[PDB]
Amino acid sequence: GAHWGVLAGIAYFSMVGNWAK
């Protein structure tokens, strides 16, 4: 299904994107 092992960084960066502001 979802390859989080290689996409876990995407979810991490998405939060940093919301966090940065």
Side-chain angles (χ1 to χ4, degrees):
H3 197 174
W4 288 134
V6 178
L7 303 175
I10 286 176
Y12 218 90
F13 210 98
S14 210
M15 230 152 166
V16 184
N18 270 60
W19 176 26
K21 184 64 185 271

